């Protein structure tokens, strides 16, 4: 089995055992959550419209993080406009436990 789930405005394919970083979910570390499923596939194959009724992917949140700092700088020539900005986009690391569905 695999599942296409949607969290943090994006869609990711998940499987039991997989680790991934999605947008920062409001949850306590070590807790578990149900991710809404848009498609199941593998043995069976079920198509969401857009989602599926009794479908949920269980994930345990291992912890939240701050990505590698990305420098975003803007420079406008001949106009003495310079800006330096440091960005660490937060994330949440999840372990996909089981695919109910």
């Amino acid at each position: 089995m695999f599942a296409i789930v949607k969290t943090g405005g994006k869609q990711y394919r998940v499987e039991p055992g997989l680790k991934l970083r999605v947008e920062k979910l409001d949850a306590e570390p070590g807790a578990t959550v149900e991710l809404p499923v848009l498609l199941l596939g593998g043995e069976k194959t079920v198509v969401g419209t857009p989602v599926v009724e009794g479908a949920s992917v269980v994930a345990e949140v291992l912890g939240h993080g701050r990505g590698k700092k990305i420098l975003v700088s803007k420079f406008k020539a001949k106009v003495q406009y310079r800006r330096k900005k440091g960005h660490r986009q937060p994330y949440t690391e999840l372990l996909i436990k089981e695919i109910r569905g």
């Binding site: 695999f2 296409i4 949607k6 994006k10 869609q11 990711y12 394919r13 848009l38 498609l39 596939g41 194959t45 198509v47 969401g48 419209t49 857009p50 420098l71 975003v72 700088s73 803007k74 420079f75 020539a77 310079r82």
Partner: protein
């Protein structure tokens, strides 16, 4: 009291030249040409961050459009099938499903032709 430059300027130049390591000629070794280079780099990265979301979506489409025609419809006709079918699987996973799990992508084709 007198405050000469002392340690300040070189430390700020050592900050910039470190961020310019890998550049060609004086672009990596000269502070001034490292600045003019790191300006351009700082803008290109901000643009190509924006352009990256554009780049992959186009790559996803071309692959989606490729696996569609193996079934007899084009990209445009397929996407509208998914809209009328109500399937919000995005183009990242769509193209992913096209190469790896074509039997699922084949099913998604049926739902698109049947929504017609």
């Amino acid at each position: 009291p007198r405050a000469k430059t002392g340690v300040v300027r070189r430390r700020k130049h050592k900050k910039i030249l470190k961020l310019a390591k890998g550049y060609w000629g004086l672009r990596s070794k000269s502070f001034r040409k490292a600045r003019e280079t790191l300006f351009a780099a700082g803008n290109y990265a901000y643009a190509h961050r924006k352009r990256r979301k554009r780049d992959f979506r186009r790559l996803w489409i071309v692959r989606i459009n490729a696996a569609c025609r193996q079934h007899g419809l084009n990209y445009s006709t397929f996407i509208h099938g998914l809209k009328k079918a109500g399937i919000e699987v995005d183009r990242k996973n769509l193209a992913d499903l096209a190469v790896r799990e074509p039997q699922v992508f084949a099913e998604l084709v049926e739902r698109a032709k049947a929504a017609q």
